[PDB]
Design an enzyme around this catalytic site. Structure first.
Site, PDB file in Angstrom:
ATOM      1  N   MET A 195      51.988  49.470   8.216  1.00 58.44           N
ATOM      2  CA  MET A 195      51.068  50.766   8.345  1.00 58.44           C
ATOM      3  C   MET A 195      51.445  51.843   7.758  1.00 58.44           C
ATOM      4  SD  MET A 195      48.429  49.124  10.184  1.00 58.44           S
ATOM      5  CE  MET A 195      48.663  48.010   9.272  1.00 58.44           C
ATOM      6  N   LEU A 246      44.533  58.314  10.108  1.00 65.37           N
ATOM      7  CA  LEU A 246      44.639  57.512  11.362  1.00 65.37           C
ATOM      8  C   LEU A 246      43.426  57.797  12.080  1.00 65.37           C
ATOM      9  CD1 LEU A 246      48.124  57.787  12.607  1.00 65.37           C
ATOM     10  CD2 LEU A 246      46.995  55.541  12.106  1.00 65.37           C
ATOM     11  N   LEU A 273      39.787  51.792  14.352  1.00 62.69           N
ATOM     12  CA  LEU A 273      40.857  51.699  15.209  1.00 62.69           C
ATOM     13  C   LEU A 273      40.499  53.033  16.286  1.00 62.69           C
ATOM     14  CD1 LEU A 273      43.684  52.195  16.240  1.00 62.69           C
ATOM     15  CD2 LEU A 273      44.160  53.529  14.349  1.00 62.69           C
ATOM     16  N   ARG A 312      48.951  51.157   4.935  1.00 53.99           N
ATOM     17  CA  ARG A 312      47.715  51.532   5.331  1.00 53.99           C
ATOM     18  C   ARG A 312      47.439  52.962   5.667  1.00 53.99           C
ATOM     19  NH1 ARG A 312      43.431  52.327   6.354  1.00 53.99           N
ATOM     20  NH2 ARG A 312      41.767  51.110   7.575  1.00 53.99           N
ATOM     21  N   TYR A 313      48.198  53.914   6.063  1.00 56.23           N
ATOM     22  CA  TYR A 313      47.844  55.100   6.295  1.00 56.23           C
ATOM     23  C   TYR A 313      48.800  56.341   5.331  1.00 56.23           C
ATOM     24  CZ  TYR A 313      45.592  52.980  10.063  1.00 56.23           C
ATOM     25  OH  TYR A 313      44.546  52.167  10.912  1.00 56.23           O
ATOM     26  N   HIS A 333      56.189  47.098  20.329  1.00 55.93           N
ATOM     27  CA  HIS A 333      54.974  48.088  20.416  1.00 55.93           C
ATOM     28  C   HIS A 333      53.841  47.420  21.410  1.00 55.93           C
ATOM     29  CE1 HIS A 333      52.757  51.749  18.639  1.00 55.93           C
ATOM     30  NE2 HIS A 333      51.950  51.416  19.612  1.00 55.93           N
ATOM     31  N   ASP A 383      64.054  49.882  10.401  1.00 55.89           N
ATOM     32  CA  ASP A 383      63.944  50.967  11.345  1.00 55.89           C
ATOM     33  C   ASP A 383      62.964  51.978  11.008  1.00 55.89           C
ATOM     34  OD1 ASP A 383      66.421  51.137  13.121  1.00 55.89           O
ATOM     35  OD2 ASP A 383      67.751  51.521  11.311  1.00 55.89           O
ATOM     36  N   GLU A 398      59.942  54.230  16.173  1.00 65.05           N
ATOM     37  CA  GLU A 398      59.832  53.653  17.179  1.00 65.05           C
ATOM     38  C   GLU A 398      61.266  53.380  17.821  1.00 65.05           C
ATOM     39  OE1 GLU A 398      57.575  49.906  18.003  1.00 65.05           O
ATOM     40  OE2 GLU A 398      56.035  50.487  16.475  1.00 65.05           O
ATOM     41  N   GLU A 418      62.015  56.998  19.597  1.00 65.11           N
ATOM     42  CA  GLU A 418      61.900  56.489  20.959  1.00 65.11           C
ATOM     43  C   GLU A 418      62.785  55.734  21.897  1.00 65.11           C
ATOM     44  OE1 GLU A 418      57.875  54.134  21.055  1.00 65.11           O
ATOM     45  OE2 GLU A 418      58.185  54.225  23.238  1.00 65.11           O
TER      46      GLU A 418
HETATM   47  C1  LIG Z   1      40.657  53.381  21.312  1.00 62.09           C
HETATM   48  C2  LIG Z   1      42.091  53.304  22.179  1.00 62.09           C
HETATM   49  C3  LIG Z   1      41.659  52.179  23.470  1.00 62.09           C
HETATM   50  C4  LIG Z   1      40.500  52.966  24.570  1.00 62.09           C
HETATM   51  C5  LIG Z   1      40.598  52.116  25.621  1.00 62.09           C
HETATM   52  O1  LIG Z   1      41.703  51.826  26.326  1.00 62.09           O
HETATM   53  O2  LIG Z   1      39.549  51.632  26.246  1.00 62.09           O
HETATM   54  C6  LIG Z   1      42.607  54.502  22.841  1.00 62.09           C
HETATM   55  C7  LIG Z   1      44.124  54.078  23.499  1.00 62.09           C
HETATM   56  C8  LIG Z   1      45.064  55.282  23.191  1.00 62.09           C
HETATM   57  C9  LIG Z   1      43.934  56.228  22.364  1.00 62.09           C
HETATM   58  C10 LIG Z   1      44.964  57.606  21.427  1.00 62.09           C
HETATM   59  C11 LIG Z   1      45.871  58.171  22.598  1.00 62.09           C
HETATM   60  O3  LIG Z   1      45.287  58.790  23.750  1.00 62.09           O
HETATM   61  C12 LIG Z   1      46.435  59.253  21.628  1.00 62.09           C
HETATM   62  C13 LIG Z   1      45.567  60.515  20.993  1.00 62.09           C
HETATM   63  C14 LIG Z   1      45.076  61.280  21.910  1.00 62.09           C
HETATM   64  C15 LIG Z   1      44.031  62.336  21.373  1.00 62.09           C
HETATM   65  O4  LIG Z   1      43.435  63.182  22.306  1.00 62.09           O
HETATM   66  C16 LIG Z   1      42.872  61.632  20.575  1.00 62.09           C
HETATM   67  C17 LIG Z   1      43.512  60.443  19.430  1.00 62.09           C
HETATM   68  C18 LIG Z   1      44.417  59.549  20.068  1.00 62.09           C
HETATM   69  C19 LIG Z   1      45.127  59.171  18.813  1.00 62.09           C
HETATM   70  C20 LIG Z   1      43.719  58.523  20.840  1.00 62.09           C
HETATM   71  C21 LIG Z   1      42.832  57.670  20.072  1.00 62.09           C
HETATM   72  C22 LIG Z   1      42.105  56.621  20.956  1.00 62.09           C
HETATM   73  O5  LIG Z   1      41.282  57.170  22.335  1.00 62.09           O
HETATM   74  C23 LIG Z   1      43.081  55.311  21.497  1.00 62.09           C
HETATM   75  C24 LIG Z   1      43.757  54.814  20.308  1.00 62.09           C
HETATM   76  C1  LIG Z   2      50.644  59.223  16.374  1.00 61.54           C
HETATM   77  C2  LIG Z   2      49.515  58.913  17.584  1.00 61.54           C
HETATM   78  C3  LIG Z   2      50.143  59.714  18.747  1.00 61.54           C
HETATM   79  C4  LIG Z   2      49.103  60.953  19.096  1.00 61.54           C
HETATM   80  C5  LIG Z   2      49.816  62.283  19.532  1.00 61.54           C
HETATM   81  O1  LIG Z   2      50.392  62.036  20.666  1.00 61.54           O
HETATM   82  O2  LIG Z   2      50.472  63.048  18.867  1.00 61.54           O
HETATM   83  C6  LIG Z   2      49.649  57.429  17.854  1.00 61.54           C
HETATM   84  C7  LIG Z   2      48.419  56.997  19.192  1.00 61.54           C
HETATM   85  C8  LIG Z   2      47.924  55.676  18.760  1.00 61.54           C
HETATM   86  C9  LIG Z   2      48.878  55.055  17.866  1.00 61.54           C
HETATM   87  C10 LIG Z   2      48.235  53.699  17.143  1.00 61.54           C
HETATM   88  C11 LIG Z   2      48.309  52.678  17.803  1.00 61.54           C
HETATM   89  O3  LIG Z   2      49.333  52.312  18.769  1.00 61.54           O
HETATM   90  C12 LIG Z   2      47.747  51.439  17.279  1.00 61.54           C
HETATM   91  C13 LIG Z   2      48.584  51.076  16.092  1.00 61.54           C
HETATM   92  C14 LIG Z   2      50.084  50.384  16.431  1.00 61.54           C
HETATM   93  C15 LIG Z   2      50.928  49.861  15.368  1.00 61.54           C
HETATM   94  O4  LIG Z   2      52.189  49.308  15.981  1.00 61.54           O
HETATM   95  C16 LIG Z   2      51.307  51.126  14.439  1.00 61.54           C
HETATM   96  C17 LIG Z   2      49.931  51.695  13.896  1.00 61.54           C
HETATM   97  C18 LIG Z   2      48.965  51.872  15.079  1.00 61.54           C
HETATM   98  C19 LIG Z   2      47.629  52.429  14.190  1.00 61.54           C
HETATM   99  C20 LIG Z   2      49.501  53.285  16.035  1.00 61.54           C
HETATM  100  C21 LIG Z   2      49.730  54.578  15.037  1.00 61.54           C
HETATM  101  C22 LIG Z   2      50.152  55.974  15.850  1.00 61.54           C
HETATM  102  O5  LIG Z   2      51.585  55.480  16.454  1.00 61.54           O
HETATM  103  C23 LIG Z   2      49.295  56.316  16.873  1.00 61.54           C
HETATM  104  C24 LIG Z   2      47.955  56.775  16.161  1.00 61.54           C
END
Ligand SMILES: C[C@H](CCC(=O)O)[C@H]1CC[C@H]2[C@@H]3[C@H](O)C[C@@H]4C[C@H](O)CC[C@]4(C)[C@H]3C[C@H](O)[C@]12C
Ligand SMILES: C[C@H](CCC(=O)O)[C@H]1CC[C@H]2[C@@H]3[C@H](O)C[C@@H]4C[C@H](O)CC[C@]4(C)[C@H]3C[C@H](O)[C@]12C
Ligand code: HEM
Ligand SMILES: C[C@H](CCC(=O)O)[C@H]1CC[C@H]2[C@@H]3[C@H](O)C[C@@H]4C[C@H](O)CC[C@]4(C)[C@H]3C[C@H](O)[C@]12C
Ligand SMILES: C[C@H](CCC(=O)O)[C@H]1CC[C@H]2[C@@H]3[C@H](O)C[C@@H]4C[C@H](O)CC[C@]4(C)[C@H]3C[C@H](O)[C@]12C
Ligand SMILES: C[C@H](CCC(=O)O)[C@H]1CC[C@H]2[C@@H]3[C@H](O)C[C@@H]4C[C@H](O)CC[C@]4(C)[C@H]3C[C@H](O)[C@]12C
Ligand code: FES
Ligand code: FES
Lengths: 359, 359
Positions: B12, B28, B34, B100-101, B199, B276, B279, B283
């Site tokens: 990713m 993202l 996603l 990917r990103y 994760h 590394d 995470e 974290e």
């Molecule tokens: C689509 C997925 C699953 C929804 C579910 O459980 O039904 C949800 C779970 C965690 C969510 C993310 C997390 O809440 C972290 C971010 C919160 C921001 O307000 C929007 C993007 C944001 C990056 C979210 C995108 C999306 O709503 C996620 C990725």
């Molecule tokens: C960075 C963002 C947190 C939003 C925020 O609180 O600022 C987090 C919320 C959901 C996360 C994503 C989701 O956990 C889904 C993917 C999990 C994979 O292990 C890494 C990429 C991955 C696509 C994640 C990228 C990034 O860690 C996200 C997009």
């Protein structure tokens, strides 16, 4: 000659006849460990009375009762026969059945073992994969027994608390899967999708740290490695009940989802129980495979045969006990670690009951 | 001479510097597979803008950026040196990085591979355990690329979509766990509790049939078997974000839970990533093993070293690609089966893209 080594086979058990259903449920809703309800001493008998009709009806659909005791007895007889030849130093061996919710109860079995004046007792869980709700409950009953009866065990205890990857258990599963694959029309054999199905757990249990999901998963991998990844697969979960969140995917939704997506040849494999019971005979064969299947039109859906009386399974049981004995272990390393979020104080006492045994 | 066989290493990715954060979050939030957001083209840029500071701050705490590309490049170079010797017939091999990103994006990498006139291309996911959210997304990007650019590949494609139990991957993990156990005071070595941390995933993803949890569980089992179950353990999950339900137990809650229950010597083991990244460095090392470990006095908490530049890991990579080539496989049998409840139309097209490749 007097029985020297006792092997207590633990299982939650099931009602033998429709009339045993009520008491089966009553004991279930009264197990402080697995359940917490206000004035649980009065809600239990009521709830049990309410669900009895529905549960009796499920067992009626599969012949009138549970066959767990029959298969447990046969596997037990085969195990003892092999042990007397495998470990003469600990013979004669005798097996006892300790059901958690039906007769013969764990407590009754323990009393009998003590009466037989055995030198050592082995708590052998019949659940290959450890869950605090299954094996843990059965082990807690052993601790609670002696604690309640205010006495010390007159025999030496130890436990075989899990065995998710025993090579012979894996061989048994693989063999039953392969022979079930032979029953599909040959033109669809490689198109078959394998659904390993295991009883689900509420997410509140999974989230406290229950070992079960990870162990069931481990069993699946071993079986598939042995089958050389001949068919695609997924591990799904069944038997969810109630409005709370349980670990998914749900087996029924998965069967239906697969069909709606063109995968109409499915092989169901009960990977977390060693014999037929309500879960396979009713849930999978009647609920899903019939009604649910008669819906989204499946081409072929079959279920791998439960281990039941497979002679190779009896050999597995004997090899486990034999290894346990020569290892001189009291319990698995895993049992020395309770759930990171465990909130039941009996768990820790139960663990100590075993790790602290003399010799 | 020119490259004959290309190995596309998929991950990713992560922002290289604080300046790359914004665009990272933007891609993202624009990914429809996603995330489904109303007026996404409007909200995505906005949310990206709002969360950039908070995430830049996280990377600032670990040095100012992700080292993923550095470790991926080192592993890739080592892999290639071995491949050229293991498989002379597949002429010179060259690795390409497909993030990917972040740059180099998957698309950019594919563009270069095709400019290089490669004969063969191997989509090698760097995630040992398959998830539709990680490896699935990377594979979807490869398919979408050719479908968008409105042309077919000029190279023969195939994929190494998963390798949760590769024997050398297992040995690397076991070796790093053992050396870390040596860093604990000798008097607490056998008291150490191993927490495998991976994760987490939203339960909505788990419930549709994602293969990830079961595969991660499989890796844990093989690592422990190789370690001969020397210490107790549990598989826990980290990185949950938001109010929705995710697969637990959560790593931080488990660390705190264990301490409050007398288990104050813990070894964290990142089991689902090979180097590394945020995470582990932030974290686990900062927000958990530093702060969290300041409320309920922990005695010793360490983290096994990420595989990173371990020479034996480069050998594992080379061995996987070599075995892949010698087998003529286009993908795992597992990829021919989409999630039982999959609702993404691209998934089926992506799998077909690989199973239908020439030769
Ligand atoms: C689509 C997925 C699953 C929804 C579910 O459980 O039904 C949800 C779970 C965690 C969510 C993310 C997390 O809440 C972290 C971010 C919160 C921001 O307000 C929007 C993007 C944001 C990056 C979210 C995108 C999306 O709503 C996620 C990725
Ligand atoms: C960075 C963002 C947190 C939003 C925020 O609180 O600022 C987090 C919320 C959901 C996360 C994503 C989701 O956990 C889904 C993917 C999990 C994979 O292990 C890494 C990429 C991955 C696509 C994640 C990228 C990034 O860690 C996200 C997009
Ligand atoms: C982890 C939490 C668990 C809970 C809360 C739970 C709960 C229950 C409850 C409430 C019942 C009675 C259902 C009814 O009367 O309609 C039941 C039955 C049963 N459970 Fe569990 N169970 C759990 C785990 C398991 C596991 C891991 C197994 C192993 C396969 C299992 C096997 C069974 C069987 C065979 C029955 C009998 C059902 C019947 O007779 O109709 N359970 N369980
Ligand atoms: C409140 C409690 C939840 C315990 C907990 O915190 O986990 C739940 C669990 C069992 C529930 C009870 C059982 O489902 C039996 C009854 C079902 C009826 O539909 C409502 C009353 C009824 C008597 C329930 C009241 C309440 O919803 C209970 C008592
Ligand atoms: C399904 C059954 C209701 C009986 C009925 O009224 O028909 C209810 C009554 C008591 C419930 C259980 C108790 O509330 C205790 C647990 C509460 C957890 O949040 C879920 C699992 C949990 C173990 C519950 C499973 C299920 O919802 C039970 C078993
Ligand atoms: C409702 C939707 C969840 C998508 C879904 O999984 O169904 C969520 C995901 C992203 C959220 C938005 C982002 O978090 C950005 C904003 C955050 C503010 O605190 C509220 C408005 C705000 C504009 C949010 C509105 C709403 O909660 C959104 C749009
Ligand atoms: S609930 Fe698992 S050890 Fe107590
Ligand atoms: S979401 Fe898993 S195959 Fe589509």
């Amino acid at each position: 000659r007097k029985p020297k080594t006792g092997i207590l086979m633990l299982n939650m058990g099931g009602p033998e006849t429709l009339g045993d259903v009520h008491d089966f449920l009553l004991r279930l809703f009264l197990d402080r460990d697995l359940m917490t309800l206000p004035i649980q001493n009065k809600l239990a008998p009521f709830i049990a009375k309410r669900r009895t009709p529905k549960i009796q009806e499920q067992y009626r659909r599969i012949g009138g009762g549970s066959p767990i005791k029959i298969w447990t007895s046969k596997q037990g007889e085969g195990m003892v026969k092999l042990l007397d030849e495998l470990s003469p130093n600990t013979a004669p061996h005798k097996y006892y059945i300790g059901f958690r919710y039906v007769h013969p109860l764990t407590e009754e079995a323990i009393e009998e073992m003590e009466r037989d004046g055995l030198e050592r007792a082995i708590a052998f869980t019949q659940y290959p994969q450890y869950s605090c709700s299954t094996t843990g409950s059965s082990l807690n009953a052993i601790y609670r027994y002696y604690n309640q009866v205010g006495r010390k065990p007159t025999m030496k205890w130890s436990t075989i608390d899990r065995w998710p990857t025993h090579h012979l258990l894996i061989q048994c599963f693989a063999d039953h899967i392969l022979k079930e694959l032979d029953h599909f029309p040959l033109e669809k054999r490689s198109e078959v999708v394998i659904l390993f199905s295991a009883h689900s757990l509420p997410m509140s249990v999974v989230n406290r740290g229950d070992p079960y999901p990870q162990e069931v998963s481990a069993t699946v991998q071993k079986v598939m490695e042995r089958l050389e990844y001949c068919n695609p697969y997924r591990l799904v979960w069944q038997s969810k009940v109630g409005p709370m969140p349980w670990l998914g995917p749900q087996t029924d939704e998965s069967i239906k989802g697969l069909c709606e997506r063109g995968r109409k040849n499915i092989l169901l494999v009960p990977i977390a129980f060693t014999s037929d019971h309500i879960e396979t005979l009713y849930e999978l064969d009647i609920e899903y495979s019939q009604v649910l299947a008669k819906e989204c039109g499946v081409e072929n859906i079959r279920r791998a045969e439960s281990l039941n009386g497979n002679p190779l399974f009896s050999k597995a049981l004997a090899d486990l006990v034999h290894s346990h004995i020569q290892s001189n272990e009291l319990c698995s390393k895993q049992l020395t670690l309770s759930c990171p979020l465990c909130v039941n104080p009996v768990c820790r006492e139960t663990k100590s009951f075993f790790t602290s045994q003399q010799l």
